[PDB]
Amino acid sequence: AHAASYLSVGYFNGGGDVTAGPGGDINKLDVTQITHLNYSFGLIYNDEKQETNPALKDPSRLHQIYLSPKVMADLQLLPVLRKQNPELKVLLSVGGWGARGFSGAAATAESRAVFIRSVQQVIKQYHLDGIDLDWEYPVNGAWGLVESQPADRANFTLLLAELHKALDKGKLLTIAVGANVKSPQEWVDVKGIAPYLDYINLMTYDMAYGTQYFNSNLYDSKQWPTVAAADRYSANFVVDNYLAAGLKPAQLNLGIGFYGRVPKRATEPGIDWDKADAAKNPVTQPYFTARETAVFKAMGLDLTKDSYFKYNDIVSKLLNDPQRRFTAHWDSDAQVPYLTMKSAEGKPLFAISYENPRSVALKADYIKSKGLGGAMFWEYGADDNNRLAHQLAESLGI
């Protein structure tokens, strides 16, 4: 006898991001289409020896939050955003891909207390509704990209318990978590931290690695199948792995990518580490030649360094390429769009998968049928005239 209520939590890369690039213009965003805005990112002053941002190496601020000048300027504009949407909640997200400092911040009673005091200071100075922690990743360290240790799992739980205790009542505490099956298994005690969190943002994207073609497929593709088992991911598979770990669906937001990736399979041999003499016997081989890589390079995407392509750029540069080099397709099993480019020999080559309005609506339908709490998306600056956010708002009744 009543309808559901859903979240739509939009990350916004305002300060700049390691993989997504320099920050966007906050003034472009339509904040009426979202329930929550995760302004990204605050960073962490840290003593990691490999830290290359010298601002973060200030020893007098160790374990506190760093806000760049652009982040501080953008956060000044919150009163304007709140007037636009009086129901909007605004959090600062701390961390992001490659962001150092969480392992050390979490490590001791003393370090945690410094970090928590800094969270409290920032929330009060900028009048935030809460804080989102995007630690990529406890225990795993993103495969050595940031410092990590096995104690990170338990220390993250302590940090969240203590931060929950320190936050004013009514403030929000949220986190983002990885797609990798090891995240709920080994990196993060999801069951243990659930009582401290308002909701959990699932990073159900960045799957176009190894032998997998699709970046954010809802279900596995059959036409374009992943070869190695350890690479075989889908948004639904990730959701089920988190549900198996004992999270309730209503606490979860399904992450949706407002971007695509050229699969690594296009340019790098795909290794199945479950095979004999694996590194010498790749199970997939690159199908881009210099011809294809040059097309992407000319558009500003150097595939030797990165594969990220914003949705707005997919629309302007790929779909609407004046030379008509890219053909749009739909994968009915995966429930997402993808583009092909024609090889010199005439064969369609899988160039990139992404999300469009139809696929965003299908992920909203999944949210509704699975009883998830809502959607999250990365990130609003990559939308095309706020269209994907609008589709999500419409589909979820925001």
Residue numbers in the entry: 18 to 415
Question: Could you give the paper's own sentences about this structure?
Answer:
A single-domain GH18 chitinase-D from Serratia proteamaculans (SpChiD) possesses multiple functions, including chitobiase activity to release GlcNAc from CHOS and colloidal chitin, and a hyper-TG activity with CHOS (DP3–6) substrates, generating long-chain CHOS14. Certain chitinases display transglycosylation (TG) activity as well as hydrolysis, forming new glycosidic bonds between donor and acceptor saccharides that can be used for the production of longer-chain and/or well-defined mixtures of CHOS with new or improved biological activities. Catalysis by glycoside hydrolase family 18 (GH18) chitinases proceeds via a substrate-assisted mechanism, which involves an oxazolinium ion intermediate and has a strong preference for a GlcNAc in the –1 subsite. SpChiD displayed an exceptionally high TG activity, in addition to its other inherent functions, and this can be exploited to increase the yield of long-chain CHOS for biological applications.
The SpChiD substrate-binding cleft contains four tryptophan residues (Trp114, Trp160, Trp290 and Trp395) with Trp160 and Trp290 flanking the entrance and Trp114 and Trp395 situated in the catalytic groove of the binding pocket. Half of the space in the SpChiD substrate-binding cleft is occupied by a loop (Asn30–Asp42), and the front face is equipped with Val35 and Thr36, which may provide favorable chemical interactions with the incoming substrate. Phylogenetic analysis of 131 bacterial family-18 chitinases revealed that all the SpChiD-like single-domain chitinases from the Enterobacteriaceae clustered in a distinct group. The novel loop and tryptophan residues were highly conserved in 18 of these enzymes, confirming their divergence from other groups. Therefore, Trp residues at the substrate-binding cleft appear to increase the affinity of substrate binding, thus influencing the TG activity of SpChiD. Mutational analysis also confirmed that Trp114, Trp160 and Trp290 are necessary for TG, and that Trp114 and Trp160 are the most important. The proportion of DP1 produced by SpChiD after 72 h was 96.4%, whereas the mutants V35G, V35F, T36G and T36F produced 54.8%, 96%, 51.4% and 59.5%, respectively. These data suggested the importance of residues Tyr28, Val35, Thr36 and the entire loop in chitobiase activity of SpChiD. SpChiD is active against polymeric substrates, which may depend on the flexible nature of the Asn30-Asp42 loop at the binding cleft. The ability of SpChiD to bind DP2 may favor chitobiase activity over TG activity, whereas perturbations in the positioning or binding of DP2 for chitobiase activity may increase the number of available DP2 molecules at the SpChiD substrate-binding cleft and thus increase TG activity. Further, we conclude that the substrate-binding cleft of a chitinase like SpChiD regulates multiple activities, and could therefore play a similar vital role in the 17 other chitinases present in the same phylogenetic cluster.
